[PDB]
Amino acid sequence: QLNPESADLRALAKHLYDSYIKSFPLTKAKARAILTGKTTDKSPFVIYDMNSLMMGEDEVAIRIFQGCQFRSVEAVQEITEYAKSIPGFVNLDLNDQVTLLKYGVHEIIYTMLASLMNKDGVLISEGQGFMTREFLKSLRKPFGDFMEPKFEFAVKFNALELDDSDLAIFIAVIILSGDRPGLLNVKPIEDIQDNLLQALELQLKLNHPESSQLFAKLLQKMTDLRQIVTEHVQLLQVIKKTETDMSLHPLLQEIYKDL
């Protein structure tokens, strides 16, 4: 009914969900509660235009871009924090630790960004605001392209109906890849991941008894994340050339450096 070996895997799933909760202020649970009128105090101010943008704080394409930027640098701090709590991560070769974060951080951001989205928009400012998908797509030419592919991923991905206990493990599976470019010692990274994969596969069947092959359907979504990161940079470098007076946080530049 539950081997002694299974228990450890549950103990791990738990330890992880816990850190996830302590490292991320806005969980999917809260995001979903805010988004589905599950309240009168949790409901966000909606921004779908210029006047709404005005009321919001009470050109546009660029203030928003900068907002996303600092929110990311923020997230990178949250993820790193989370990373330190993954059994064995800190015990790894220091360099390898940096590589993992480098290549893992944006795939993790997109996964979690989805928790804050629905097909009409996304929560912003800790869930106090909600920016619509169409208003975002109308931003000045190049900028009107930053959010769409994310929105596109989010709809396919939210379809899996995963929750924070599921995500806490999947996020750790992402960081502990091993097929990342430039790893010195792969064997150790792979042993940790082999472990994380076990815990996620169990966590998924217990938590989604009816969902057939969710474990695999989930692991496949990983190709979608890479394509998102890949595309974002191509689009990010374009912005870098048109807008010469625009900057990209040093931390964020170190991530994208020779990715």
Ligand X SMILES: COc1ccc2[nH]cc(CC(=O)O)c2c1
Binding-site positions for rosiglitazone:
69-72, 106, 232, 256
53 binds, among a copy of itself, ligand X, none (CB under 5 to 8 A by kind): none
Nearest of 67, 73, 164 to residue 125 by alpha carbon:
67
As a whole number of angstroms, the distance between CA 250 and CA 164 comes to 30
| Interaction of residue 65 with ligand X, rule CB under 6 A | yes
223 binds, among a copy of itself, ligand X, none (CB under 5 to 8 A by kind): a copy of itself
124 binds, among a copy of itself, ligand X, none (CB under 5 to 8 A by kind): ligand X
| Interaction of residue 32 with ligand X, rule CB under 6 A | no
| Interaction of residue 207 with ligand X, rule CB under 6 A | no
138 binds, among a copy of itself, ligand X, none (CB under 5 to 8 A by kind): none
| Interaction of residue 88 with ligand X, rule CB under 6 A | no
Q: Pick the stretch among 33-41, 70-78, 191-199, 211-219 that binds ligand X (CB under 6 A).
A: 70-78
Which H/E stretch holds residue 130?
strand 129-132
Query: Which contacts of 137-143 are long-range, i.e. CB under 8 A and separated by 24 or more positions?
Result: 139/60, 139/61, 139/64, 140/59, 140/60, 140/61, 142/235, 142/238, 142/239, 142/242, 143/61, 143/62, 143/64, 143/65, 143/239
Query: Binding site membership: which residues?
Result: 69-72, 106, 232, 256
Q: Say how many CA atoms lie within 13 Å of 210 toward its Cβ.
A: 3
Size of the site for a copy of itself (CB under 8 A): 22
The smaller minimum CB distance to ligand X, of residues 7 and 251, is found at 251
Count, residues in the chain: 259
Helices (H), 37-178: 50-57, 60-84, 94-115, 133-137, 148-158, 164-175
Which one of residues 28, 30, 150, 221 is an interface residue with ligand X (CB under 6 A)?
Answer: 150
Q: Pick the stretch among 85-93, 161-169, 190-198, 245-253 that binds a copy of itself (CB under 8 A).
A: 190-198
Tokens of 144: 């009107």
The smaller minimum CB distance to ligand X, of residues 131 and 218, is found at 131
The smaller minimum CB distance to a copy of itself, of residues 130 and 157, is found at 157
Residue at token pair 């791990």:
12
